[PDB]
Amino acid sequence: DLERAEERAELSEGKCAELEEELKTVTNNLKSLEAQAEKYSQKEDKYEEEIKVLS
Amino acid sequence: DLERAEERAELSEGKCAELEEELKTVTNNLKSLEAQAEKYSQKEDKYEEEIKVLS
Amino acid sequence: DEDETTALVCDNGSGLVKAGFAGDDAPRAVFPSIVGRPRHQGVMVGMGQKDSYVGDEAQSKRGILTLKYPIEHGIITNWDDMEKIWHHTFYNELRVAPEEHPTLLTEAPLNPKANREKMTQIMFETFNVPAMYVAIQAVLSLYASGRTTGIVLDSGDGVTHNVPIYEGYALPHAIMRLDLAGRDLTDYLMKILTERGYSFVTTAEREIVRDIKEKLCYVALDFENEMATAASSSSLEKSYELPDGQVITIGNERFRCPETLFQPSFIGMESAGIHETTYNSIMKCDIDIRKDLYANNVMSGGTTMYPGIADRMQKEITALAPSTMKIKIIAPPERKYSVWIGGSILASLSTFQQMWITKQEYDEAGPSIVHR
Amino acid sequence: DEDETTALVCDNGSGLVKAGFAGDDAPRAVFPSIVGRPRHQGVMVGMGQKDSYVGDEAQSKRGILTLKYPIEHGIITNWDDMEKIWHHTFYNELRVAPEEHPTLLTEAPLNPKANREKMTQIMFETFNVPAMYVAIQAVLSLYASGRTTGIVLDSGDGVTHNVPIYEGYALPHAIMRLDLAGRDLTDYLMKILTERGYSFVTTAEREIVRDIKEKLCYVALDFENEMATAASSSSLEKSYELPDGQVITIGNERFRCPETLFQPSFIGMESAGIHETTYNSIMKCDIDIRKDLYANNVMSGGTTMYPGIADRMQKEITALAPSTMKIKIIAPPERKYSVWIGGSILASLSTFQQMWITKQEYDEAGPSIVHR
């Protein structure tokens, strides 16, 4: 019943690690996209105000 | 060594599930922020071209 | 606080310097390890004549300077140009005065005795730091992953290493060095991508092949039936948009680049690859310590960040190791700074104070003192 | 209770120490008889500099220390290192303070008069025990099997002995010592197993050959037509799984190792073997006592534990002894601790109190007192 319990444990630990890893990568890709989005929104509002004033 | 292998298996399966759940939530928050970012970038480029042309 | 705040950690690499204060979670300063020397006389508007350039100003202005790398393969090769990178680190990057900060530095795996004495000579005699300490890089990486025995596969910009460590002592005779790393890897992608029918013609095309390698490259497990997959042409492909519109597509080569780390034969290298080398290090160590090393393969370095590197290595050494063995490949997320973080921990530690080499030790014992 | 609880029994061996409280059924403490001295300066994490290591910490850390064995062939050869093993036994292993516990110690068969006086000098003058007593090892083994006359074949890690005992007095002129024991026996298996086409290369391969010897080795009766049996290749073979998967098979050699105890010629020894030596001891004794010794061959010691040792010895001496004689080979199950158990019994006994050498006897008579 053991080689079975240990094999299931190892496969679920492997799965666990793969998912935990896929996550540091998606949550990190994030701080990057959310920061890029805010940076662009602020560049947008600035140029929207400058177009009003040149118009 | 068993009650130990099974107990470690159960705790790692629990951990695995918690992390897999936290993820559907962060990858989903994402398609949303990335889509908002692209939508704003396109509003930005449009107004940047219109400010160029009024200037 | 005197030095709790005050300890500096400088990790000198072949491609990047990582620097900051012991205590922080990540390097305050990261920048290229170059020193540019202007090919012509002249000035930028508003500045004076500059004899030299370091880090990013050397990279940005590379067209008018002759660029030089002080650290070849992890070892300091030019000491005039290294003292220049240190100067830049303290005074411009961290903006600290060095003469009131203890400095933890790092060196490479089989760093020549004479070098560890020379950078001590320059730290104490030209920068006048209060105290300093040189840690071995793999050893800080291991320790930053909590443990004290394990084997580190360390891979950055100019070198790859395997450093088996037992209760803190790195094992000299079992260490392996493979001179193929992220630098070699960007240049190989370059060719398989021009070979895909492309041109990285201007310098704004060159530089970004490296950003393609970092963002889109993969280490597939079963690299065999991944090429096979490439052919059926799934939605495996991946297009990157260049500085301009010029949408370049990379489907397949995406993983042909890190398969170079397992097959050096992709690049005319006759040396063995990462996984075999992990293993050979291990069958060069004492017998009784080999179960420990196998369950503690810690990975560190920028080039070990390719996703699925750990799964490929997992299966690469399981299938070479005796089945009675437990394999375990630890690859943390912050691994591009493991080395640095291990230094930050150690140097901010409560017990490390008694290993700092002080100017008292030095002025009294000569460079020999820190050399150990 | 004062000392009913309080008597200690320490059996000092060439390979192992066995220790505990008189009264118990088995030793509370069993550990190697080594004293390790670090080859280099340095520390384990969290500990201080250690000058010395004893028992299992010396074995576990053997790669950085020079290991030394205080007892060569049952006799104490280094008294600085023995006082170290005793210190460890009292203070760390049994965690008792010695100055309030009577201590029964053991010595070897023809232990030099001067040694029995020296360990008494160290017991009373550096450990300050209330009282002590030195029993001869074969004599405690016999007694633990109930009787008082018999001949003990005693075999441990560095020595084998035959000690004919009559109404308690071990017979000096009939005692035989054969310097080939379990230590010699593990190293011979080692070679017949590498010779089977193997490699005990790392220290985790070395150590376990000894665990193969203990678990799988046999003493076959009719070792002649057991080799013959090996050849027809029956299901006589036996595979052991190593620290890892590496399933090693041992069919035959399994018994070629204890056939060394009857044939010393297997190992370039010209001495006679166990059974002949049992016998020769016996035709060196008085005539009238030889029927007694023959019906009371008591076996003790780790190396006499090989299954079928008793049957081979049974038939080995029947066929050398006059047919008018009764042969009887007693081999109890607890025999790896006979010596110790015999001491536990004796020292917890109601009548032994009047043989304890007290500090009163000593401070008044000199080491001579216990020497007898």
Take residue A4 and report the two structure tokens written for it: 């079975």
Resolution (A): 35.0
For residues C189 and C209, the answer to whether their CB atoms sit within 8 Å is yes
* C and B make contact (3+ CB pairs below 8 Å): no
Nearest to residue C6, comparing CAs of C130, C105, C123, C102? C102
Task: Give helix D309-318 / helix D274-282 axis angle, nearest 10°.
Answer: 50
Take residue C144 and report the two structure tokens written for it: 């930053």
Q: What angle do CA D58, D64, D70 make, to 5 degrees?
A: 40
Nearest to residue D122, comparing CAs of D15, D10, D34, D29? D10
Q: Do A54 and B50 touch (CB under 8 A)?
A: no
Take residue A1 and report the two structure tokens written for it: 């019943």
Residue C111 CB: number of other CB atoms within 10 A?
Answer: 17
For residues C10 and C33, the answer to whether their CB atoms sit within 8 Å is no
For residues C160 and C74, the answer to whether their CB atoms sit within 8 Å is no
Nearest to residue C15, comparing CAs of C4, C2, C31? C31
Nearest CB neighbour to D245, from listed C287, C288, C325: C325
H helices of D264-325, where? 274-282, 290-294, 309-318
Distance from C-alpha of C243 to C-alpha of C245, rounded to nearest angstrom:
7
Query: Could you tell me how far CA D103 lies from the centroid of its own chain?
Result: 19
Distance from C-alpha of C2 to C-alpha of C100, rounded to nearest angstrom:
9
Indicate the pairing of strand C65-68 with strand C75-76: unpaired
Distance from C-alpha of C287 to C-alpha of C285, rounded to nearest angstrom:
6
Distance from C-alpha of D4 to C-alpha of C363, rounded to nearest angstrom:
65
Cα four-point dihedral sign D279, D284, D288, D293: negative
For residues D20 and D340, the answer to whether their CB atoms sit within 8 Å is yes
Which chain D residue has the Cα nearest residue C284? D202
Instruction: Identify residues of A whose CB sits under 8 angstroms from chain B CBs.
Output: 2, 5-6, 8-9, 12-13, 15-16, 19-20, 22-23, 26-27, 29-30, 33-34, 36-37, 40-41, 43-44, 47-48, 50-51, 54-55
CB contacts < 8 A, C to D, total 47
Stretch (H or E) spanning A5: helix A2-54
List of chain C residues whose C-beta atoms are within 8 Å of the C-beta of residue A18: 311
| Residue matched to tokens 């057991």 | D226
C38 CB burial (10 A radius; 0-12, 13-18, 19+) = middle
Take residue C300 and report the two structure tokens written for it: 């560190």
Distance from C-alpha of D258 to C-alpha of D186, rounded to nearest angstrom:
10
Residue C113 identity: K
Distance from C-alpha of C192 to C-alpha of C212, rounded to nearest angstrom:
12
Residue B7 CB: number of other CB atoms within 10 A?
Answer: 12
Residue C354 identity: Q
Torsion of CA D71, D72, D74, D78, to 10 degrees: -40
For residues C102 and C132, the answer to whether their CB atoms sit within 8 Å is yes
Nearest to residue C333, comparing CAs of B18, B25, A17? A17
Take residue A10 and report the two structure tokens written for it: 């190892």
Which chain D residue has the Cα nearest residue C143? D45
Distance from C-alpha of C190 to C-alpha of C200, rounded to nearest angstrom:
8
Report DSSP state, residue D44: -
SS3 D152: strand
Nearest to residue D309, comparing CAs of D246, D218, D232, D224? D218
User: Solved by what technique?
Assistant: cryo-EM
CA distances from C146 to C206, C289, D204 (A): 39, 18, 25
Instruction: Identify residues of C whose CB sits under 8 angstroms from chain A CBs.
Output: 307, 310-311, 314, 331, 333
For residues D132 and D98, the answer to whether their CB atoms sit within 8 Å is no
Torsion of CA C75, C332, A37, C17, to 10 degrees: -10
Nearest to residue D103, comparing CAs of D79, D124, D126, D133? D133
Q: What angle do CA D92, D98, D99 make, to 5 degrees?
A: 145
Take residue D222 and report the two structure tokens written for it: 């009719």
Distance from C-alpha of D4 to C-alpha of D353, rounded to nearest angstrom:
10
Take residue D239 and report the two structure tokens written for it: 């595979």
Distance from C-alpha of D4 to C-alpha of D292, rounded to nearest angstrom:
34
Nearest to residue C84, comparing CAs of C25, C118, C33, C138? C33
Which chain C residue has the Cα nearest residue D40? C169
Nearest to residue D252, comparing CAs of D195, D207, D210? D195
Nearest to residue A26, comparing CAs of C309, B6, B30? B30
Nearest to residue D316, comparing CAs of D297, D291, D288, D301? D297
Nearest to residue D10, comparing CAs of D81, D83, D117, D59? D83
SS3 D293: helix
Strand order in D65-68's β-sheet?
D53-54, D35-38, D65-68
Min CA distance, B7 vs chain A (Å)?
9
For residues C34 and C8, the answer to whether their CB atoms sit within 8 Å is no
Distance from C-alpha of C39 to C-alpha of C37, rounded to nearest angstrom:
6
Stretch (H or E) spanning D9: strand D8-12
* A and B make contact (3+ CB pairs below 8 Å): yes
Residue B18 CB: number of other CB atoms within 10 A?
Answer: 11
Q: Do D45 and C321 touch (CB under 8 A)?
A: no
Min CA distance, D187 vs chain C (Å)?
18
CA distances from A35 to A42, A48, B37, B43, C215 (A): 11, 20, 9, 17, 17
Nearest to residue D257, comparing CAs of D296, D215, D297? D215
Nearest to residue D144, comparing CAs of D356, D330, D304? D330
The neighbours of chain D, by the rule of 3 or more Cβ pairs under 8 Å, are C
SS3 D321: coil
For residues D240 and D269, the answer to whether their CB atoms sit within 8 Å is no
Nearest to residue C358, comparing CAs of C128, C140, C136, C106? C128
Nearest to residue C103, comparing CAs of C14, C21, C1, C18? C21
Torsion of CA D332, D334, D335, D337, to 10 degrees: -150
Cα four-point dihedral sign D64, D70, D74, D77: positive
Residue C279 CB: number of other CB atoms within 10 A?
Answer: 21
Distance from C-alpha of D230 to C-alpha of D223, rounded to nearest angstrom:
10
Q: Do C148 and D45 touch (CB under 8 A)?
A: yes
Cα four-point dihedral sign D83, D89, D90, D92: positive
**β-bridge partners, C357:** C132
Nearest to residue D231, comparing CAs of D255, D252, D254? D252
List of chain C residues whose C-beta atoms are within 8 Å of the C-beta of residue D246: 322-324
CB contacts < 8 A, A to C, total 10
Label each residue of chain C as H, E or C: CCCCCCCEEEEECCCEEEEEEECECCCCEEEECCEEEECCCCCCCCCCCCCCEECHHHHHCHHHEEEECCEECCEECCHHHHHHHHHHHHHHHCCCCHHHCCEEEEECCCCCHHHHHHHHHHHHHHHCCCEEEEEEHHHHHHHHCCCCCEEEEEECCCCEEEEEEECCEECHHHCEEECCCHHHHHHHHHHHHHCCCCCCCCHHHHHHHHHHHHHHCCCCCCCHHHHHHHHHCCCCCEEEECCCCCEEEECCHHHHCCHHHHCHHHHCCCCCCHHHHHHHHHCCCCCCCHHHHHCCEEEECHHHHCCCHHHHHHHHHHCCCCCCCCCCEECCCCHHHHHHHHHHHHHHCCCCHHHCEEHHHHHHHCCHHHHC
CA distances from A20 to B7, C294, D296 (A): 20, 22, 70
Take residue B43 and report the two structure tokens written for it: 């509003």
Nearest to residue D352, comparing CAs of D166, D171, D136, D131? D131
Residue C295 CB: number of other CB atoms within 10 A?
Answer: 14
Distance from C-alpha of C328 to C-alpha of C336, rounded to nearest angstrom:
19
Residue D218 CB: number of other CB atoms within 10 A?
Answer: 20
Indicate the pairing of strand D238-241 with strand D103-107: unpaired
Name the CA radius of gyration of chain B, rounded. 24
Q: Where is chain D broken, named by the residue before each break, C–N > 2.5 Å?
A: none
For residues C181 and C303, the answer to whether their CB atoms sit within 8 Å is yes
- A16, A18, A36, best to mutate vs chain B, most B CBs in 10 Å: A16
For residues C160 and C177, the answer to whether their CB atoms sit within 8 Å is yes
